[PDB]
Amino acid sequence: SMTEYKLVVVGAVGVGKSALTIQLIQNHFVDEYDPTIEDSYRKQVVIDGETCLLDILDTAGQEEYSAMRDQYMRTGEGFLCVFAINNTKSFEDIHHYREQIKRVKDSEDVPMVLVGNKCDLPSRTVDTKQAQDLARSYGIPFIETSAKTRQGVDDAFYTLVREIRKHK
Template sequence: MPRNHKRSSANGHVNATTKKSKDKPTYKIIVLGSGGVGKSAVTIQFVKSFFFSDYDPTIEDSYVKQCLIDNQIAQLEILDSAGQEEFKPMRDQYVRVGEGFLLVFSLTDRRSLDECYKLHRDILRLKDTNNVPMLLIGNKLDICQMGMDAHARAAAASMCIPYFETSARTRHNIDEIFIELVRLIRRNKCQYQTNNNISSSKKKKKQENNTKCCICTIL
């Protein structure tokens, strides 16, 4: 049976950690990809430093972990999503609320890379913007026997997103992908705020000019 658990925090102090971190910046990260590519293994390795080797199809697993990234506290809310097609409506809902996305495929399965193309298109469509923090993740580097590096890099280039290769078993690049995604989310938020400030400033200036134009002198 597929899992439908909600797990939190690697340190075991879920409630205390959550209460203390209400005022900390929170980053909603969604892990997406075909079934069997190692989404759960990657997530659990990051959160709990444990390699989860058994394949147990996931419906929804959620985790919370606090990290210090670039000298700033970050609370990561990570959702490990279902890879099966029948759960696509749920996946679309996750995309709508997510701030950053890991598109995971297996380096041993070319078809799982093709699925990431579809996921990328769906995310851009649902977000209605081309500026969405995303990483393409080639997992199972430790057992890779296929020359997929060129295909994967070409895919990442066509999607205009960074590419990382990982191994949930050896923990290779596991921390790095979550850290890099948080950095992308931060930059995206900063750019959004800057654009809003510029827009507000222009609107205020326009209103001031309109007010000046409406002043009449009666002789």
């Protein structure tokens, strides 16, 4: 059967992890705020001509439960690290997520994509140049997205699969 890829979506509260995932899976924009406990989704897609199955874990941004992330980081094969371009604090939180994944995986070479979400909004506080420079220092792709307009949604998840394929 087609290869399955275990993807994990992480980032601070309210950056759009669920909105991005529900756009990918259900082609629908969630405008209301429904903070996540834990949700899983499945979707088959074609990436570079090869059909595969995305198994996506949508995680909670709650800082109170940061010590409970280790198990899903052990199981995940690739990570979408999401911040919001109008939320400087969520961008600062990214470093903490990457360090946590690196520590759990004990590796500098973990499939990851940096995602700057909410690019439809006029209230930008994180420059594209800052985020490109951070992704470069990590050695990972950076993609700007909007769960509202669907800009970059497929591309962010597809790029993460391409990163997994290159690593294994």
